Amino acid sequence: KAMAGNFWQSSHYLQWILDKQDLLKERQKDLKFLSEEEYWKLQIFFTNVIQALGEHLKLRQQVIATATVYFKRFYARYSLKSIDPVLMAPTCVFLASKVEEFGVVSNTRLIAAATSVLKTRFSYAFPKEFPYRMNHILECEFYLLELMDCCLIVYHPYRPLLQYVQDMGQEDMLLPLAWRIVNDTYRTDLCLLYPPFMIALACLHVACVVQQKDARQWFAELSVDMEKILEIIRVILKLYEQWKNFDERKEMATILSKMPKPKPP
Amino acid sequence: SKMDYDFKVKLSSERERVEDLFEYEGCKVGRGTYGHVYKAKRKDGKDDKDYALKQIEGTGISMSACREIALLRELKHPNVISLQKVFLSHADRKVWLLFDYAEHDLWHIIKFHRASKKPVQLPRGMVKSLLYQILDGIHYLHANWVLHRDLKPANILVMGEGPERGRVKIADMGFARLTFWYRAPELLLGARHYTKAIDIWAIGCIFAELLTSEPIFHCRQNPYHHDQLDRIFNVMGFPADKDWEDIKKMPEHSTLMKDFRRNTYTNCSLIKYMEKHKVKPDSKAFHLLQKLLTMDPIKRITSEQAMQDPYFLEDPLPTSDVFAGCQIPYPKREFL
Ligand SMILES: O=C(Nc1ccc2c(c1)Oc1ncccc1C(=O)N2c1ccncc1)Nc1ccc(Cl)c(C(F)(F)F)c1
C-alpha cells in the first residue's frame, strides 16, 4: 500500500515518463540489426517470457507488472546486446519480488522456474537449455539497480482502474475485460510514456466499446485531456492488429538470431 | 554470453566509487549486522555539508535493503530522513547508503538531561517543537500508507549546525529487524497486524519522556510480556470495559485475565503519575498526551488531529529549529 497516492511526486513520474522522441532516438541503435516490426515482436516476446515466469512462481500480477516495467526501462536506455534479455527477465522478476514486498524467491526456485519455463513453454525459441546460475542473476541485479537509479516503486493502471469502474458503478460487468486490456498494454511502450491513470482510462474506454456500453456522459464529466487518452486508444487498437499478424512461435527464432548479441573479451 | 564487454568497461570507466568521491574517516558506529556508518565529507569543495556513509554488512542486496532503498527513494518530507544516493561496488558486492548527517538524536539529548548532577527539565519550547516535527513526519508517512513500527527516542534524529539547524528527522536504523517501553498495549496482548495507531502510542511515550525526562513505561528485563503490561497498568491504571470494549477480542485476553486482577491498580492513573513529575493536569500538554496515550487503539487520536491541537496554538509556539536560537550543549558523535 506504500506510496499509493504519491504518483505525482514519485520518481516513476519524475524520472521514468520518457519522451517518445528520446525513446525512439536511443532505440535507433538496435534498429541496424533489426527492423521496427521485429523489435516490437521481441519486446512483446519477453513480456510473455516474464508473464510465463511469474505465473510459474505464483507471483501476483503487479509483481509481474513491476518486473515487466523494469525490463522495458533497462532496454529503453541500453541495447539488446548490453545484457542478454534471457538473463535480464528472471533478474527483473527477482528484483520485483524483493522490492514488491512479496518475498525473496528461493534461489533454487528462481533458476528452476527459469529453466522449466523456457523448456516447457518456449522450446520453439530456445533449444539450448537455460544456461545461467544464481551467480549471474546477482551480478545482473547490480547493473539493473544502477540503470534505474534505484527507482523501484512502480505504479500500474490496476489501482486507478478499480476506482474508475467502481465509482462509475458497474464494476462487475466491465472490469474483467478492462483488466485483461490493461494486461495487454504491457505488450507496448505505454507504461513508459503515460501515467497509469490515463492508460487505465483508455483501457476502460475500449472495454465499453467491446461490450457496447455507452459511457460518454461519464467520460465527458471527467476533467481529463481526452485528446491524450485517445492516443492510447489508438496504440491499444494497433496492439490488436499486431496480435493478429504475429505468429511468435513461427517467427521468433529467426528474430532471435537477428537480434545483436553480447561480445566477449 | 551474458553481458557484452564494451558495455562493462564503459560502465567501469564512468561509475562512481564511494572510496574516491568521499573522505570518510569518522566511524560514527559499528554494528553486528548493520555494517559501518561514517561521518563523511565530499572530496570536491562543492559543499561543506556532512553526510553519513553506511556500508551494509552483507554482500549482495538484502530484501530489507531493497525495501529500505525503495521506500527512502520516494519519501520527500523535511521531517523524514533523506537518502541522497546509493553506491554499489560490483567487485565486492557491497552497498553504500548516503544520508544527510544528523549530529544528534533524542536518546542522546534526553540522556544528557540526566547526566548533569537529578534531572533538569527540558525547555518547554523545545518539547513542543520536538513533538510537532515528530507529528509532521509520522503524518506524512502515514498518509503514504507507511508504518514505522519502531518509534522510540533513538530513532528521532535532530539536525545540528547547518541549514537545517534543529530539525527533527525521523529514521529507522533497525529496519532489517522488522525494551518494550514504547510498544502499544494491543501488541502486548497479541495483535497480529501493525497499525497507524501503534505509532501514535509510541509518539505519546516519547512525549511523556520529553516532559518528565524519564521513560513513562520503563521496565526491567512470546508476544505477551506480563511485566511490561504491569508497568502500563501501574502508570495508566487498568482499563475498564467501557474504556476498551474490544479488549476481550484480543488473543491474550485470557492470559491477561489469568495474570492480573484489576483491583491492583485502583489508585493508578495518568493524572496521578503526571502529577508527581510536575506536569499539571489542567495543562494543554497533558490533555493532548492523554489523547495520544489511550489504551483502546481506535479511541487514540491521529497524527493530523494532534497537529491540530490547541497545545501548539498556546504559547510558546513551535519553531522550525527545535533549539530556538540558543547554543547546542549536547556533545557531538564520537569516532571509533
Ligand atoms: O532510516 C533509515 N536508515 C538509516 C537512517 C539513519 C542511519 C542509518 C540508516 O545508518 C545506521 N545504521 C545502523 C545504525 C545507525 C545508523 C545511523 O547512524 N544512521 C544515521 C545517523 C545520523 N545521521 C544520519 C544517519 N531507513 C528507513 C527505512 C524505512 C523507513 Cl519508513 C524510514 C523512515 F521513513 F521511517 F524514516 C527510514
Q: Is B86 annotated as a binding residue?
A: no
Peptide bond into B316 cis (omega under 30): yes
Q: For B68, which residue in chain A has the nearest alpha carbon?
A: A99
Question: For B5, how many CA atoms within 13 A lie in the half-sphere containing its CB?
Answer: 3
Q: What domain range includes position B123?
A: 102-336
Grid cell of A220 as nine digits: 465527458
Q: Quick one: angle between helices A61-77 and A134-148, nearest 10?
A: 70
Cβ distance of A2 and B71 shorter than 8 Å = yes
| Residue A41 alpha carbon to ligand 1 centre in Å | 44
| Nearest-neighbour CA in chain A from B52: distance (Å) | 19
Distance of CA B336 from the midpoint of ligand 1 (Å): 19
Cα–Cα nearest to A10, from B79, B144, B135:
B144
B173 CA distance to ligand 1 middle (Å): 4
Same domain, B154 and B9: no
Residues B184 and B41 in one domain: no
Does B271 lie in the same domain as B130?
A: yes
Decide which of B86, B101, B116 is a domain's last residue.
B101
Say if CB A50 and CB A89 are below 8 A apart: yes
Domain stops at, among B101, B132, B148: B101
Let me know whether B81 and B222 are in one domain. Answer: no
- Asked if A74 and A27 count as a contact pair (C-beta separation under 8 A), the reply is no
Q: Count contacts between A and B (CB, < 8 Å).
A: 101
Residue A154 class from Cβ within 10 Å (0-12 exposed, 13-18 middle, 19+ buried)?
Answer: buried
Domain closes at, from B63, B84, B101: B101
Residue contact A262–B2, C-beta within 8 A: yes
Overall resolution, Å: 2.8
Distance of alpha carbon B267 from alpha carbon B191, whole angstroms: 28
* Among the partner residues B5, B7, B145, nearest to A264 by beta-carbon distance: B5
Strand residue runs (E) in A62-213: none
* Chain A residues near any Cβ of chain B (below 8 Å): 1-6, 9-11, 78-79, 81-84, 87, 95, 98-99, 101, 103-104, 132, 136, 138-143, 145-146, 150-153, 261-265
Within 8 A by CB and 6+ apart from A214, the residues are A208
The catalytic residue among B150, B172, B199, B309 is B150
Cα B333 from Cα B108, distance rounded (Å): 10
Q: Are residues B79 and B115 in the same domain?
A: no
Note whether B120 and B246 are same-domain residues: yes
The answer to whether residues A59 and A97 touch, using CB atoms and an 8 Å cutoff, is: yes
Please report, for residues A181, A205, A232, the alpha-carbon distance to residue A218 in angstroms, rounded to integers and kept in the order given. 20, 11, 19
Q: Which residues pair with B106 in a beta bridge?
A: none
Which residue is it, cell 553480447? A262
Instruction: Answer for the pair B148, B196: CB distance below 8 angstroms, yes or no.
Output: no
**B132 and B61 in one domain?**
no
- Beta-carbon separation of B67 and A4 below 8 A: no
Examine the domain organization and report whether B13 and B140 are in the same domain.
Answer: no
d(CA B207, CA B306): 12
Count of domains forming chain B: 2
Counting DSSP H helices and E strands in chain A, the numbers are 14, 0
User: With the CA atoms of B10, B19, B69 and A91 taken in that order, what torsion angle do they form, in degrees rounded to the nearest 10?
Assistant: 40
| Pocket test residue of B62, B175, B177, B332 for ligand 1, highest count of atoms within 8 A of CB | B175
| Residue A104: DSSP 8-state | P
Greatest Cα pair distance, chain A, in angstroms, is: 63
Q: How many angstroms separate the CA atoms of B94 and B98, rounded?
A: 13
Decide if B144 touches A, using CB distance below 8 A: yes
Same domain membership, residue B251 and residue B123:
yes
Neighbouring CB atoms inside 10 A of B221's CB total: 5
B51 and B189 part of one domain: no
Q: Residues with Cβ < 8 Å from B210, sequence gap 6 or more?
A: B106, B110, B122, B126, B127, B130, B131
Pairing of strands B35-42, B104-105: unpaired
Q: Could you give the CA distance from residue A232 to residue B5 in angstroms, rounded to a whole number?
A: 38
Which of A10, A84, A141 faces B74 most closely, judged by CB atoms? A10
- Does B150 participate in catalysis according to the annotation? yes
Whether ligand 1 lies within 6 angstroms of the CB of B134 is answered as: no
SS3 for chain B is CCECHHHHHHHHHHCCCHHHHEECCCEEEEECCCEEEEEEEECCCCCCCEEEEEECCCCCCCHHHHHHHHHHCCCCCCCECCEEEEEEECCCCEEEEEEECCCEEHHHHHHHHHHCCCCCCCCHHHHHHHHHHHHHHHHHHHHCCCCCCCCCHHHEEECCCCCCCCCEEECCCCCCCCCCCCCCHHHHCCCCCCCHHHHHHHHHHHHHHHHHCCCCCCCCCCCCCHHHHHHHHHHHCCCCCCCCHHHHHCCCHHHHHHHCCHHHHCCCCHHHHHHHCCCCCCCHHHHHHHHHCCCCHHHCCCHHHHHCCHHHHCCCCCCCCCCCCCCCCCCCCCCC
Contact A78, A92 (CB under 8 A): no
Give CA–CA dist A168/A234, Å, rounded: 23
Name the phi and psi angles at B51, rounded to 5: -135, 160
Do both B115 and B21 map to the same domain?
A: no
User: Do B319 and B216 belong together in one domain?
Assistant: yes
CB A153 within 8 A of CB B73: yes
Q: Is B132 annotated as a binding residue?
A: no
Residue B266 contacts A, CB cutoff 8 Å: no
